[PDB]
Design an enzyme around this catalytic site. Structure first.
Site, short mmCIF file in Angstrom:
data_model
loop_
_atom_site.label_atom_id
_atom_site.label_comp_id
_atom_site.label_asym_id
_atom_site.label_seq_id
_atom_site.Cartn_x
_atom_site.Cartn_y
_atom_site.Cartn_z
N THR A 228 -6.63 20.51 16.76
CA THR A 228 -5.28 20.39 16.20
C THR A 228 -4.93 21.62 15.36
O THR A 228 -4.76 21.56 14.14
CB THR A 228 -5.13 19.11 15.38
OG1 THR A 228 -5.71 19.29 14.08
CG2 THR A 228 -5.79 17.93 16.07
N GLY A 229 -4.83 22.75 16.05
CA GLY A 229 -4.64 24.03 15.40
C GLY A 229 -3.36 24.18 14.59
O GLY A 229 -3.42 24.28 13.36
N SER A 230 -2.21 24.20 15.26
CA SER A 230 -0.95 24.48 14.59
C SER A 230 -0.13 23.24 14.26
O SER A 230 0.71 23.30 13.36
CB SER A 230 -0.09 25.43 15.44
OG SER A 230 -0.61 26.75 15.41
N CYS B 70 -12.37 23.41 24.00
CA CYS B 70 -12.52 23.06 22.59
C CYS B 70 -13.74 22.18 22.33
O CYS B 70 -13.97 21.79 21.19
CB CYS B 70 -11.26 22.35 22.08
SG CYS B 70 -9.73 23.29 22.33
N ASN C 46 -14.90 20.79 27.43
CA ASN C 46 -13.69 21.57 27.61
C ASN C 46 -13.77 22.86 26.80
O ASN C 46 -14.82 23.21 26.24
CB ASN C 46 -12.46 20.75 27.22
CG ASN C 46 -12.38 20.49 25.73
OD1 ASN C 46 -13.34 20.03 25.11
ND2 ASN C 46 -11.23 20.78 25.14
N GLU D 142 -14.57 19.04 23.04
CA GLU D 142 -14.39 17.66 22.60
C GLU D 142 -14.08 16.70 23.74
O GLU D 142 -14.20 15.48 23.54
CB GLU D 142 -13.28 17.56 21.54
CG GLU D 142 -11.95 16.99 22.00
CD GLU D 142 -11.08 18.01 22.69
OE1 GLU D 142 -11.35 19.22 22.55
OE2 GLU D 142 -10.10 17.61 23.35
#
Ligand SMILES: Nc1ncnc2c1ncn2[C@@H]1O[C@H](COP(=O)(O)OP(=O)(O)OP(=O)(O)O)[C@@H](O)[C@H]1O
Ligand SMILES: Nc1ncnc2c1ncn2[C@@H]1O[C@H](COP(=O)(O)OP(=O)(O)OP(=O)(O)O)[C@@H](O)[C@H]1O
Ligand SMILES: Cc1cn([C@H]2C[C@H](O)[C@@H](COP(=O)(O)OP(=O)(O)OP(=O)(O)O)O2)c(=O)[nH]c1=O
Ligand SMILES: [Mg+2]
Ligand SMILES: [Mg+2]
Ligand SMILES: [Mn+2]
Ligand SMILES: [Mn+2]
Ligand SMILES: [Mn+2]
Ligand SMILES: [Mn+2]
EC number: 1.17.4.1
Lengths: 683, 289, 289, 683
Positions: D576-578, D377, D375, D379
């Site tokens: 899991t950015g923000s 990201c 994807n 993962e």
């Protein structure tokens, strides 16, 4: 350097102060006795040639299977009996480089001019040997020329599509935008030029489901289409050519125009997508009165009224748009916008100008739809209905996307043979066949419009060649009188052939009953005004041919009322760029750009004199840039009054004149009834 | 017609010496012969000395005499690049490759060198001869400036580009390429300002200014040939450097709107690898016929 | 002891107005009264004039007369900022907020405004009076430059800062803060050069130079009062701005090594709130662990 | 400057040589005393609040109508009974700036943390008040965090889709390319990140309908996709994000990579299109032995074998491709290609690296398809089947396009509550509900694969935070022991919940019978290797929680054999950015980049220390750049052995290390079984 190249360059070497035009003829002989005859592939008889071309996937076997080999042999013998000779080196060179069929490795020539003409005629006739011979005689006499797609690809297995231009309506939705991109790539893959109407797309800073200032406007769709046309570039052979048309009352009209500014940033500049601007009479009226105009946000208008901004008449709804607080608009200076148009056309030749009211005041199919945009050459002006491409697993509402087949009459050859009627009817039949055998499986609106409208485009070439070779100045009133009479004859016989096809097939085009053909309004000016030549010289030029009078037009009107018309649109005058070389004709009805054109091919240079150029007609072959553009506008309007679609009208400007002169020419064209303006080419 | 466009191109080309790390050049510098190191040092000092004249005098003097706020701003920006960016960049290259004592000696030598001095003083002489409100003297100085930016630097640029095209002294070669890219646009811009003056002159005065430009070019060119042999014979490159000088002389002439003086020649491939209509408002009654 | 650190500070502060998008101010601008918009346009136009002359004339002329390549590089950089960055930024603001006719009118207004013409006459006169190798004429021009940098700009800066501090016109305000940050270091630097010259003098000469500086300040001050009233009376702020310019006059004196001249006053707290990688080949041993 | 911002910036001000971390807490109070409470809309009762939010089109009526108002009030009371307080200013700031529901004018706060959590819980439970209260207790204890799409949009009428990771397969056709562009635009419109596999697309210089040198390659498709992603940018809110994956044996791989070089021209470089490279074990073997490799033309392979190049195992197919004369290939140096990858990652962090055999040697659904790409990201690693999108009015062959459901466990909060099993099962249930409630009407293969595969991604975060607050170095063997045990328990309970859901609903995922779950192979390493902690400290950390043994794994294997498994994929560790800010957690399983991070919001500066950072654990909160990347690779491989999908694994490099060090880290990751490498962030 080749011998024919030297002979062709010998034209400019003056002898006794005169050009050696006859040397050109010698060049052709050389070009045939040293290159074409040696590079041609000869077979024992026609049977071996046809078999080799069929099994090697050069020809489609279906169209050849409709004739016995005796009939095909008779057609080829009819083609070769004329002993056609190319009068100029460039005619033969252009045919054998762009249109003659070559081998897979392109090392040898498989098709002669007669072979290509015979194959095209056999494809046109669809199993009729006599009709095939008629087409052979029409094309070998060079009275009629099928368009480059049709002439090049007819009867070929590796062919593309025979339709030159496609016009797409893009609805204001992401699904419709993506479908338009897909269809544009599909049609550019097929080789056709694609034009897209972006006037329904909402402008920049509009709301996508209640979140405001979200849309990228027509410029983002323009960038998407530009990349799509760059990607689909005819397998890398011909650069993908697209056109975007926007109404001048669209809010993005400036940004639209800013796509063609030479100082535009890369995120805005679009380079492979031509731009056209559709100007209603309201904009010209506002500019004339110097009253500040308003450009509109299409989505607000659609929300308030339920219809798109370009779906209704601006001349009657502009004040309602302005006075409506629920409609969003921006103030503009219409005169400043006109000056911007003139400056852009001076710098780059863009945008195309479409005078919407000039198109729709004589449009015969306003009931189906008004003409809202034109094609890539700005000569196709037909009704189009936008399609509603819905989500996946949902049925799409398929509209009408314009598509017509091009074919040009050679005016000099048609009038020399005194065969306006026969040539027009045979060309109409050939274009009808091209429309009937056209089936595009990836453009649904184009397919539906081809099946329903049955629209064809019958153009004309060698107007200036005929006028100069007959001692008539292109700007003279005699030339306009000739154009009036000739194109009235062409329109008369095209309408007659369309009605005859409708009678023989028992079917008309879709929604013909609401057209001005059915109501008889279309024939009004033809049943009250006589279009016979007003000058004795033109009447002598038309001798031996029955010029239709008001009585013949009344009879044709009654015949149409009784039987209908098979074609919604019949006549459109395309630019006819490269196929005019093969026919030894001047490009379209435009005046010649130059008397002798110097073109560089490979490492060599060649000079093509205009067809029939000589000492006695040197000054009758006046260059277009030296001509008064107002008189060229008069000629184009005179022709346009008899053409149901538009004419690719290129403006030929001098470097000395200003943008004010260009604006004056545009406004005179609008005043004279010019439907579209193609290019502003500056010398 | 052109100053805002050049403003944009100039400011977007802004760079600083610190951006290129120089220390990794020592890994190829150590492998050059004495003659190669000597030529490089001498060429570098030549460029440094000429560019200092351009920063202290050439650009500021032209900015002083040219009328127009926007032109003065562009010219100021160019002067800044000479003094704040280019001069520091040349110093950085030197300090990386040679010890302090070697730098001082090379500059002493090049300062006394007959061919470097001849061209440096010829250019400076024309800058010193500009007179207030005299556009002829300004034009002559602009010609001198274009010749420096677009022509005289190139007998020097040749060598760093030659190494750069071979994979040698890549960090300093990158710096030189950025400098050269600035001098190219400086030459084009000053060239347009000179053409503006030239086009305001009579036909006789034009012919006289053309003769001035060609005569000056000839003097500088003959000295460049001597300068070239003096530096490049010891490394066997003079023939190819001479082709590069003529090619760049032609570019300088084209910047001044003049025809090329020298026949077209191909350039060393290693060095190559290193390298509106008048708007008139609608007056009304144009809508009526 | 200071030029290198000023060089580094100046080049690290480099910016262009295009880095700041201005369309965000469109609404807070639309919402101001006609009086407020008029004062704002005129204020920035007065600033534009000052930077035009500081860039075209003041900084280049001081650069010409100050000795040392590094000192010249700093002064050349400051000159570029004045006309290529600062003066131009005001046009970016004007072109965003105002129609062309209002822009044309305000530039016509600078030409005919008597206070703006007087202050330009006085400052530029001193710049053009500098005599080569005459340190006293140079000192006088440096005092004039410090007064332009650290005092004269502030009748103009007040208003963008006053709005910024209320959360209004914050994009334009961001540009102005960057300009102000530059002028503060420009005023300090030129102040240090002026002090160098002053410190060379006899006590008698020093006494005369202080007289010159104070007389000039008072003359400029009296003119600035009239300018301030002319601009700010229509927005009700003249007294507040006057306190601000006195505050900054003291800073200008301090930049020159002189004692403050005006008594301290409370400034509007709104205005105070307004303030490539190295490459190694892969070995066969890097594929095994 | 606001008071809370001053209190936050007072952290850096050192008192007694120590950072004032506790001051951050005070800032939170200020941020709630001065701003949040003042701008929070309050209602007389929850009934009025719900009525206002539903009527004003903030919420959806359907999910609230499944409960009586008493049940909704009880769920809200359960949420508010925790009296949750944000421990750091940045947590509350990020929630109330990114996730809290605001009015249409964006000046008032309609949703608190408890309100948003209650709404998400009510949406998750789908009518079960007790299940809703369980979800509320899960999220208010901050044990589980739904992804940004789910957390932000659950229960909101004005919302995008709850899935934001989409993987598309693009077939080698113009119709498929246009459909891929359309689907990418539609999914970016929904707010999702779209990854497209371009390996099936034929390279540049391939034949289209037996005409040579016609294909533009994958770079033209990348340009089209980049334009599509620029156009579709969430209604002008976020920059459109897309990823393109190409197999390293595709011939375009260099040009692909050349799209990320700074020196690339404007017609070559794509700016908003991330790129990833799929590296089979064959490429690594060729580079290791220094043998010259071959990049193949995909269309020639497809013509010769009837299957795409990326659809067959290159380990057994490479020699046959090389020895096949009908397969066209180009010679390359694999070590040079690896160095180019390392250099490009140093310059820009691109491309993402997918080790195909590392993914597929543990892939449970190789029978459906091998994982060909990842994807945006890097993962999501799932089986995908390409779709055959045919012409219009022709039925498409709909394949499988990956779209997994994201959600992250907070390792610190989960383990301090001794609730690995309950949190994992509840998160699995919520992810199943969100996957079942996702219906995308413009992506047919995405919808089909969501219905069939039922794949979810359950991630983890705060690994480094938990380890540092427990006196464990991230690179220590004890940290890897804890990760092994914790993620083995997570996998055990995820498989148990999937099997329980399959038993309850009576259905498994499509083609489960061919999976390694059905055959019991997946459980092999679990029925033979004991994953209990080997260190006493980790065992004491796991005290109070049952650690599944080999007998428990055998029982789970038998349960899966009897009942099946509902989800094809269950676990994937997203960046899991923000959401890591709101949960006061370190991002993903990655080590922290900075101990205290400095951010600029508006014209103000803010300071976020890592959660639980103090003087005692300052040394244990080692920065990622200072860490040995080999030990980070070891930890990520230890986690990956218990994750069926991939882990977003960003490399953290110093500016001193060269491309050889980057290549060594990549090769050690390949050796250690790392499936994907996300980014190369250079300090
Ligand atoms: N201008 C031309 N256009 C087309 N074909 C030409 C032309 N010139 C020569 N050819 C071809 O090359 C052949 C060369 O013959 P040429 O024209 O010299 O006369 P020929 O041998 O007497 O016979 P004929 O004219 O009857 O064909 C022609 O038969 C024809 O096939
Ligand atoms: N750190 C925090 N995190 C979240 N909310 C907070 C925080 N600090 C204050 N608040 C909000 O502000 C309110 C006031 O909290 P305060 O610290 O003054 O005392 P309290 O005893 O919790 O107050 P209350 O009567 O509101 O429950 C809290 O109820 C809560 O809504
Ligand atoms: C999705 C999207 C749409 N648009 C513009 C282009 C389209 O002409 C226009 C319509 O998009 P639509 O596809 O019609 O969006 P919508 O139907 O969800 O919204 P609405 O109900 O208001 O019609 O929005 C963008 O500019 N960028 C985008 O990313
Ligand atoms: Mg819509
Ligand atoms: Mg195909
Ligand atoms: Mn320089
Ligand atoms: Mn220079
Ligand atoms: Mn300034
Ligand atoms: Mn200053």
């Amino acid at each position: 350097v080749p011998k024919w190249i030297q002979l062709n360059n010998e034209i400019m070497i003056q002898k006794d102060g005169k050009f050696q035009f006859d040397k050109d003829k010698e060049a052709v002989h050389s070009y045939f006795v040293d290159y074409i005859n040696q590079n041609t592939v000869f077979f024992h008889n026609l049977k071996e040639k046809l078999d080799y071309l069929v099994e090697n996937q050069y020809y489609e076997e279906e169209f050849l299977s409709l004739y016995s080999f005796e009939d095909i042999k008779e057609v080829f013998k009819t083609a070769y009996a004329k002993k056609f000779r190319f009068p100029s080196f460039m005619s033969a060179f252009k045919f054998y480089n762009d249109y003659a069929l070559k081998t897979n490795d392109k090392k040898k020539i498989l098709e002669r001019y007669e072979d290509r003409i015979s194959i095209v005629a056999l494809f046109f006739a669809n199993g009729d040997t006599e009709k095939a011979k008629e087409y052979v005689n029409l094309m070998i006499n060079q009275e009629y020329q099928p368009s480059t797609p049709t002439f090049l690809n007819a009867g070929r297995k590796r062919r593309g599509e025979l339709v030159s231009c496609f016009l797409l309506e893009v609805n204001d939705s992401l699904n419709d935008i993506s479908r338009a991109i897909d269809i544009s790539m599909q049609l550019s893959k097929l080789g056709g030029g694609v034009s897209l109407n972006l006037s329904k797309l909402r402008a920049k800073g509009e709301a996508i489901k209640d979140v405001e200032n979200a849309t990228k406007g027509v410029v983002g769709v323009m960038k998407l289409l530009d990349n799509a046309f760059r990607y689909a570039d005819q397998m890398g052979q011909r650069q993908g050519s697209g056109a975007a048309y926007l109404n001048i009352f669209h809010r993005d009209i400036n940004d639209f125009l800013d796509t063609k500014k030479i100082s535009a940033d890369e995120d805005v500049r679009v380079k492979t997508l031509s731009i056209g601007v559709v100007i209603p009479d309201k904009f010209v009226e506002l500019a004339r009165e110097d009253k500040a105009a308003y450009v509109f946000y299409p989505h607000t208008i659609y929300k308030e009224y339920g219809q798109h901004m370009d779906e209704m008449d601006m001349n009657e709804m502009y004040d309602k748009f302005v006075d409506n607080p629920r409609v969003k608009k921006e103030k503009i200076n219409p005169r400043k916008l006109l000056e911007k148009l003139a400056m852009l056309r001076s710098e780059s030749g863009y945008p195309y100008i479409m005078f919407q009211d000039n198109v729709n005041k004589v449009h015969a199919n306003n009931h189906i739809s008004k003409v809202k945009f034109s094609n890539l050459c700005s000569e196709v002006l037909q009704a189009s209905q936008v399609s509603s491409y819905t989500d996946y697993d949902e049925e799409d509402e398929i509209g009408l996307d314009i598509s017509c087949n091009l074919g040009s009459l050679n005016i000099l050859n048609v009038m020399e043979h005194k065969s306006i009627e026969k040539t027009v009817k045979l060309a109409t039949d050939s274009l009808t066949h091209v429309s009937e055998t056209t089936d595009i499986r990836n453009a649904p609106a184009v397919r539906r419009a081809n099946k329903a409208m049955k629209s064809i485009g019958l153009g004309a070439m060698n107007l200036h060649g005929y006028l100069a070779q007959n001692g008539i100045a292109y700007e003279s009133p005699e030339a306009r009188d000739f154009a009036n009479t000739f194109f009235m004859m062409v329109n008369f016989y095209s309408i007659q052939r369309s009605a005859e096809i409708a009678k023989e097939k028992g079917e008309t085009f879709d929604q013909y009953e609401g057209s001005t053909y059915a109501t008889g309004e279309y024939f009004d000016k033809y049943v009250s005004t006589d279009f016979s030549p007003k000058y004795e010289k033109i009447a002598n030029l038309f001798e031996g041919m029955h010029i239709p009078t008001t009585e013949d037009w009344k009879k044709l009107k009654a015949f149409v009322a009784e039987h209908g018309m098979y074609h919604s649109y019949r006549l459109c005058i395309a630019p006819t760029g490269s196929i005019s070389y093969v026919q030894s004709s001047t490009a379209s009805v435009m005046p010649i750009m130059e008397r002798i054109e110097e073109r560089t091919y490979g490492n060599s240079k060649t000079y093509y004199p205009m067809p029939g150029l000589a000492s006695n007609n040197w000054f009758f072959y006046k260059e277009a840039y030296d001509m008064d553009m107002f008189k060229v506008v008069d000629m184009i309007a005179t022709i346009q009054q008899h053409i149901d679609q538009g004419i690719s009208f290129t403006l030929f400007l001098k470097d000395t004149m200003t943008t004010r002169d260009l604006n004056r020419i545009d406004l005179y064209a609008h005043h004279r009834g010019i439907k579209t303006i193609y290019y502003a080419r500056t010398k | 017609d052109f100053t805002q466009m050049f403003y944009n191109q100039n400011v977007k080309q802004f760079w600083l010496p610190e951006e290129i790390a120089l220390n990794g050049d020592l890994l190829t510098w150590k492998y050059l012969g004495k003659n190669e190191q000597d030529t490089y040092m001498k060429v570098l000092a030549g460029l440094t000395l000429l560019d200092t004249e351009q920063g202290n005098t050439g650009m500021p003097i032209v900015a002083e005499h040219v009328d127009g706020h926007q032109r003065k701003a562009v010219l100021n920006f160019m002067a800044m690049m000479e003094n704040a960016v280019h001069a520091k960049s040349y110093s950085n290259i030197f300090m990386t490759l040679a010890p302090t004592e070697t730098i001082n000696e090379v500059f002493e030598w090049v300062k006394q060198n007959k061919y470097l001095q001849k061209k440096a003083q010829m250019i400076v002489g024309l800058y010193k001869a500009i007179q207030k409100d005299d556009e002829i003297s300004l034009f002559k100085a602009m010609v001198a400036s274009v010749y420096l930016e677009s022509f005289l630097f190139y007998s020097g640029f040749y060598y760093p580009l030659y190494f750069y095209g071979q994979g040698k002294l890549m960090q300093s070669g990158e710096i030189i390429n950025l400098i050269l890219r600035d001098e190219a646009i400086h030459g084009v811009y000053v060239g347009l300002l000179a053409q503006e003056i030239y086009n305001k002159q009579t036909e006789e005065k034009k012919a006289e200014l053309r003769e001035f430009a060609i005569d000056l070019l000839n003097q500088l060119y003959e000295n460049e040939l001597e300068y070239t042999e003096d530096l490049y014979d010891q490394v066997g490159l003079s023939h190819d450097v001479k082709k590069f000088i003529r090619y760049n002389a032609n570019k300088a002439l084209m910047n001044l709107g003049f025809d090329p003086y020298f026949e077209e020649e191909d350039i060393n491939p290693i060095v190559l690898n290193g390298l509106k209509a008048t708007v008139e408002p609608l007056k009304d009654d144009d809508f009526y016929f």
